[PDB]
Amino acid sequence: DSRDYSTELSVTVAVGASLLFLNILAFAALYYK
Amino acid sequence: YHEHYMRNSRAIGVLWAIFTICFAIINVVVFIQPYWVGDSVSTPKPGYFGLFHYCVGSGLAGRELTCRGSFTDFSTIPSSAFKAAAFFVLLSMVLILGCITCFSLFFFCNTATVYKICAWMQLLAALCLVLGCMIFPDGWDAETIRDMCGAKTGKYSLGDCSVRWAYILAIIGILNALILSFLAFVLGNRQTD
Amino acid sequence: CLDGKDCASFFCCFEDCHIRIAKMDSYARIFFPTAFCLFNLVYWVSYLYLG
Ligand SMILES: CCCCCCCC/C=C\CCCCCCCC(=O)O[C@H](COC(=O)CCCCCCCCCCCCCCC)COP(=O)(O)OC[C@@H](O)CO
Ligand SMILES: CCCCCCCCCCCC(=O)OC[C@H](COP(=O)([O-])O)OC(=O)CCCCCCCCCCC
């Protein structure tokens, strides 16, 4: 087994950034009067 | 304009609930899955460990990952720091599940009150998750963690091992929890219009 | 306090308080079933699939 963790961390950071960016879109819809 | 504002507020509330459920899923997954820290090529023995659970290899060119640890039995947890971190993460999970339960209160109670209740409870869950993530490294100086990772490890000293997906997902959960708390606060203060 | 809302005017309510405890039975009609269902969802997922 290749004992490296980059693709795993890559997908984890990707989904995390996706959820975070969705929440920033929620802020964008919110603060916009 | 009023109907547009009402539709936007309703949609943002629904999406906030969806993201709250997603963050609860994240909190449960990081609490359960033992992939907070992981071996490396320089590690003498292969294995990993979470908040409380830990699997280690025997070291005979095979996996044979003997797995020990359980939050339900505090004796098996390697260190007091691990116990405190696991307790804080459990408390955060309880808080977010409590807000998911309090979603039902939108039927009866005023929307501002329920929004602010989950705002405060998500804030407390975020602080508990921060405390757990800050206290968890203190137990790296435990004898079994040192044995697995190596002698270089210590309090706030990763050494040879590497942080795996669960720890970074927990950090993402902290960020998402703080964000959801702020979103709930602003939604509660905005629905009055 | 941009919104003129301080840490007691924006975040925490501190309004009135409770008063509406008379209809507290109505909350338990939905609160108790939800918490137990939520408890079952992660109790069984934790032991059967995740670990
Ligand atoms: C696997 C995970 C499972 C987790 C699921 C756990 C289930 C949790 C329990 C119940 C959820 C449903 C609750 C629905 C409540 C929504 C009820 C509602 O819409 O209320 C109205 C406000 O709308 C509003 O803007 C409030 C909007 C926010 C609502 C937030 C909850 C949405 C949940 C929708 C589910 C999405 C799908 C998720 C499935 C994965 C006004 O009301 P009403 O004038 O009459 O009086 C209120 C007072 O002010 C005066 O009496
Ligand atoms: C064996 C399982 C049987 C379950 C049968 C459930 C049928 C319940 C239908 C609800 C009927 C209804 O809406 O009227 C009751 C009250 C009316 O409002 P108010 O009088 O509380 O202000 O409504 C409410 O305010 C609270 C309604 C609570 C609904 C959730 C019930 C959950 C039942 C699942 C138990 C496993």
Ligand SMILES: CC(C)CCC[C@@H](C)[C@H]1CC[C@H]2[C@@H]3CC=C4C[C@@H](O)CC[C@]4(C)[C@H]3CC[C@]12C
């Ligand atoms: C009352 C509502 C709002 C919240 C309920 C919280 C529930 C879901 C919490 C409280 C205690 C938790 C348990 C505490 C300890 C363990 C041992 C671990 O090895 C698997 C998860 C498991 C079994 C947890 C599952 C979730 C749990 C049952």
Ligand SMILES: CCCCCCCCCCCCCCCC(=O)O
């Ligand atoms: C209706 C409210 C209760 C909601 C909770 C429903 C789940 C009850 C638990 C039933 C035990 C099921 C056992 C599952 C394990 C198995 O059979 O292999």
Ligand SMILES: CCCCCCCCCC
């Ligand atoms: C796919 C893993 C699912 C883990 C359980 C999620 C629990 C959500 C609690 C509402």
Ligand SMILES: [Cl-]
């Ligand atoms: Cl266990």
